[PDB]
Amino acid sequence: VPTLPXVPXG
Amino acid sequence: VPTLPXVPXG
Amino acid sequence: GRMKFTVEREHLLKPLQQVSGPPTLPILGNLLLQVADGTLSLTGTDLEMEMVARVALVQPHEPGATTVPARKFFDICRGLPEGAEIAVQLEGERMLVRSGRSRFSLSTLPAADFPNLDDWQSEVEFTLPQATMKRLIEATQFSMAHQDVRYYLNGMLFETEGEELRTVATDGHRLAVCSMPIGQSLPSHSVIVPRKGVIELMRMLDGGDNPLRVQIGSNNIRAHVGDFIFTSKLVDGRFPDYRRVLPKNPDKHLEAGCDLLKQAFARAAILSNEKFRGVRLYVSENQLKITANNPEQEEAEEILDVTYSGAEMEIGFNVSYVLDVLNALKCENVRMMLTDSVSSVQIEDAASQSAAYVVMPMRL
Amino acid sequence: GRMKFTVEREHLLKPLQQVSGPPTLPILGNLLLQVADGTLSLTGTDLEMEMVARVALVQPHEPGATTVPARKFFDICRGLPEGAEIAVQLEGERMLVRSGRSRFSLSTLPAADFPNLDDWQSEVEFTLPQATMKRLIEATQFSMAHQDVRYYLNGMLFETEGEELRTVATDGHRLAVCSMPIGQSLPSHSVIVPRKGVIELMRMLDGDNPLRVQIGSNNIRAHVGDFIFTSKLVDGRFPDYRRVLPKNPDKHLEAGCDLLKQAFARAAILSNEKFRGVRLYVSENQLKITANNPEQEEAEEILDVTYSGAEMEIGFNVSYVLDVLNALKCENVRMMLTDSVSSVQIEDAASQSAAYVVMPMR
């Protein structure tokens, strides 16, 4: 379940 | 909180 | 097996919903499907009650039987577009459902393991309007206990006598009884219908012109509506006799408007104890005063014009029980029959004796 | 004190309902009542936000202030009959409510203990239709996180830029963004409204008449009719929605909103109850949706669509997808894809004001 490309956090 | 007098039970 | 059928969505939807009585054994979550003699039969059960629906098959079919997950099958047919055609066949341990370019493959269990409910001799038999059954249950359902040690109080008594069918429900603090004529000479018989049977019963009524046929048989009750048949076990126990909790000679008769009394009690209840909910009634000549207090020392007072000429009296009541009765009566004028501050009160529609309600007072 | 007023039930009902929309501190369950200058003021707070209503007093009254249990006072007024008059006066540590032959005595707490929100400098100020604010919130509310350790994701971003007001919400897996024009030159500003603030904002909307907003460094305020709402902002750094929008999603798919929704809803019946994964096979003018659950049951849907790109198969959480389709209420939907491991962008085919981004599954 990969995540929105958020930095940090994903 | 008395009860309806069922017989038994009240 | 060989089971195969094709039917319109519109003819399958109400059958499926009714047998899908909304964490059990695997097979009990499934519907039994049977194709035979131009008829599709759908059955759902929980070992205690059973629901069977019949659907006519006007398109080619092949006899057979299987079981499929009930909710998933109903959601599939309900999710299809209106006017859809649903084709069903078996393929090993799977049921293939096809409609348009939608394909579904549901897991099955053998029909030979679906439990059949054995036969029983019908002892009482009668038919009555759906509206009559609806009135009998709605008049008393709210008084039933819930998860009571006395398992016989969780259900609703169904009593036959002369020309009338009667329902009774009580939880030990309040009682409701309602009798209705049905125009048939019936024997005398007293049975307890469990809580879930009452609910399923209520579910069967479509407010239509298809009369309801009842069969009662010692340990089982059966109901027929159109192409539907509901069967339920009875509760094994002795129900208390409502005739012995009716107050004798409640000679203090108070009459008041149904709506005004209800609004006055609803307002006073705001400042009553959250746990015990006690309100206090002062009955005097043509006047009723209702008061309520809570641990925070807040106070409410209502004064109503009523019809009353008996002795003055002070009596307390769980206001929730009183409101329950007033909402069930849906009346224009209500009649309260009082005896004294420690005795039960009988409440009725001022212009109808078909229903009666008995409520014990509290001490304040 | 001397507080005393008599007012029609009908003029007090809606005011009371709006302020008493909340088991915390005793005083926080109470409304602050104030009689002053021919006006009755009702205030409710939860220490982080507050609602204030003002009602005109056309009958004799005496100034004063007290606090009274909100829910009980509301239920009393709403329980009184239509056209009733409600007379209120103070009797020591109690408030007496009279109407007809109905009497109520409620306990009070001193008004001096009702908490005041600090003053703050307004930095951005604008007005806009209530319907516009309604659209902005409804377009993105469902995408907010709930109880996320990233406290800032539990709210909704409100961003001003040029002529447009913008809203953004995301929980780390999907994101929603909606921009509307308000016709005013605005300063660039970006603040996070907390979850409960968004709810109260929606409650005070009906949808043509104006709504006035004031944004500060740590507070936001909204004026609607005789109502004023104030909330504290969330102190954090909201991610940049520009950096999660897929770059160059060249695969464009268009389909019927309703037909696509019904297909996904049927497929979801046989998807995994926990992961809710469905598989999308896209080919020339065709979409094929499949679902499988641990019990080895299988669903399949085939739809006619508008698509001319390379063949691709990509998985999705069918609940996130349906959420977007329920939010769009569209005729035709447009999905912009890149590859099987990259985010997708979903919009109304005939409206760019709102966009949705959803990450795929494996």
Author numbering:
A (entry chain D), B (entry chain C): 2 to 11
C (entry chain A): -1 to 20, 25 to 366
D (entry chain B): -1 to 20, 25 to 208, 210 to 365
What do the study's own words say?
Griselimycins (GMs) are such promising anti-TB antibiotics that bind and inhibit the mycobacterial DNA polymerase III sliding clamp (DnaN). Despite sharing only 29 % sequence identity with msDnaN, the binding pocket of ecDNA shows a sufficient degree of conservation. The binding pocket can be divided into a larger (subsite 1) and a smaller cavity (subsite 2) and as has been shown previously for GM and mycobacterial DnaN, all compounds occupy both subsites of the binding pocket.
The crystal structures were solved at resolutions of 2.12 Å (MP A), 1.65 Å (GM) and 1.50 Å (CGM). The compounds bind mainly via van der Waals interactions with interfaces ranging from 550 Å2 for GM to 590 Å2 for CGM to 600 Å2 for MP A. Compared to available structures of uncomplexed DnaN, only a few residues undergo significant conformational changes upon binding of the compounds - most notably Met362, which has been described to function as a gate between the subsites. The linear, N-terminal part of the ligands in subsite 2 superimposes almost perfectly, while MP A seems to be tilted slightly (approximately 7-10 ° compared to GM/CGM) away from the protein in the region around Pro8. This tilting can be attributed to the longer 5-methyl-l-norleucine residue of MP A at position 6, whereas leucine is present at the same position in GM and CGM. In the complex with msDnaN, GM adopts a conformation very similar to that of MP A in the ecDnaN complex, although GM lacks the 5-methyl-l-norleucine at position 6 and the residues lining the protein pocket around this position are conserved between mycobacteria and E. coli. In comparison to GM and CGM, the higher potency of MP A might be attributed to the increased hydrophobicity of the substance and the larger van der Waals interface with DnaN. The 5-methyl-l-norleucine at position 6 might also play a role by pushing the generally less-tight bound region around Pro8 out of the binding pocket but stabilizing the tighter interaction around the ligand’s bifurcation. The co-crystal structure of ecDnaN bound with MP A and the nanomolar binding affinity of MPs to msDnaN validates DnaN as the molecular target.
